[PDB]
Design a protein around this nucleic acid. Structure first.
Length: 158
DNA sequence: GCATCCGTGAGTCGAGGGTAATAAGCACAATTTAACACTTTTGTCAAG
């Protein structure tokens, strides 16, 4: 599944590149792990080889899957709760799962709100969280620095 | 009344020394304060 040098993202923390298989002592007999690394923050990670795909360790969008996300930004939207509580809740949830399409979509309707009616000091924080994570994986897939990715996102709008 | 508890005290002046760090949020109504426009007062000036 995950090979030594597979470049994949391990949400929520952000993008990074894995490293390899290890035996870390946990409970009983040592189970194989993916040592997974990250770019900026210096910390290691160990992801169970049992079910790494269902645990939230997923792949990275191909260089060809960018336009669908940029389009999920420019024109993209989604329904949001009325009460500010539940709204914040859902924003946090999508900012948890790590699903790139979902996060792009959320950022889409949220951003659509910031430029029209207005945005609170909460929903906007989460919005910027989304835009930043987007910048991370669009930087990782397209092999460009965060500047050009955030400039793709600023290309969507202006 | 006989052991066992709360209660109150206990030295003078000084010299310095010192400085510091927890906690939810968002829309909106109600005022407060800052801004601005302009009338009046008052102090100054040219010159009786």
């Amino acid at each position: 599944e995950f090979r030594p040098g597979d470049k994949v993202v391990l949400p929520p923390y952000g993008v990074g590149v894995v490293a390899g298989i290890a035996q870390r002592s946990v409970s009983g007999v040592s189970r194989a792990y993916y040592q997974v690394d990250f770019p900026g923050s210096r910390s290691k990670a160990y992801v169970p080889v049992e079910a790494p795909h269902s645990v939230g360790l997923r792949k990275a969008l191909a260089p060809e899957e960018v336009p669908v996300i940029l389009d999920l930004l420019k024109n993209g939207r989604m329904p949001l709760p009325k009460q500010w509580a539940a709204r914040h809740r859902k924003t946090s949830e999508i900012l948890a799962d790590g699903n790139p399409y979902r996060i792009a979509q959320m950022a889409g309707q949220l951003r659509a709100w910031e430029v029209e009616r207005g945005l609170p000091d909460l929903d906007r924080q989460a919005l910027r969280r989304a835009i930043h994570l987007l910048a991370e994986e669009v930087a990782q897939s397209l092999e460009i620095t965060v500047q050009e990715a955030k400039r793709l996102f600023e290309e969507a709008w202006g």
